[PDB]
């Protein structure tokens, strides 16, 4: 399916945002 | 191709989980 | 949809570059 | 295009591998 695609994209992108948050934490803990 | 597209989407997803896990461990080491 | 698929692929890509940059800076802070 | 898709997937995945390498460095620098 083509939406199914787009679906998975949306999820992948979601993970990326979280990773970006997780990196913001780690940069702060590094002073 | 769509199967391949579908396989690579999962692969991307499983790397993301791996990455989020690596980063999770670093965040807590730095703790 | 294909345009949207195409837009989200780029978005994913630009986050990846951002992430690789964050991580690049942490690797060198730790240096 | 559907290959164009798959194409971008391949690139995204490539970035993920590198990110994984970059994280392996950073975990080593963290002892």
Swiss-Prot record, chains A, B, C, D:
Domain of life: Eukaryota
The record's account of how the chain is modified after translation: Phosphorylated by the cyclin-CDK PCL5-PHO85.
Protein name as it appears in the record: General control transcription factor GCN4
Quaternary structure annotation from Swiss-Prot or TrEMBL: Homodimer. Each subunit binds overlapping and non-identical half-sites that flank the central CG base-pair in the pseudo-palindromic motif 5'-ATGA[CG]TCAT-3'. Interacts with the mediator tail; the interaction with GAL11/MED15 is direct. Interacts with the SAGA histone acetyltransferase complex. Interacts with the SWI/SNF chromatin remodeling complex.
Protein source organism: Saccharomyces cerevisiae (strain ATCC 204508 / S288c) (Baker's yeast)
Protein localization: Nucleus
Induction: Translation is induced by amino acid or purine starvation, or during growth in low or poor carbon sources. Translational repression during nutrient-rich conditions is dependent on four uORFs (upstream open reading frames) present in the 5'-UTR of the mRNA; these promote ribosome dissociation. Translational induction occurs in conditions reducing translation machinery efficiency, leading to ribosomes scanning over the uORFs, and increased translation of the mRNA. The rapid translational induction is followed by transcriptional induction at later time-points, independently of the uORF sequences.
Family assignment from sequence similarity: Belongs to the bZIP family. GCN4 subfamily.
Domain notes: Residues 89 to 100 and 106 to 125 define the N-terminal activation domain (NTAD) and the central acidic activation domain (CAAD) respectively, which can function independently to promote high-level transcription of the target genes.
């Amino acid at each position: 399916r083509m939406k199914q695609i787009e679906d998975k994209l949306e999820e992948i992108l979601s993970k990326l945002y979280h990773i970006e948050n997780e990196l913001a934490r780690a940069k702060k803990l590094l002073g």
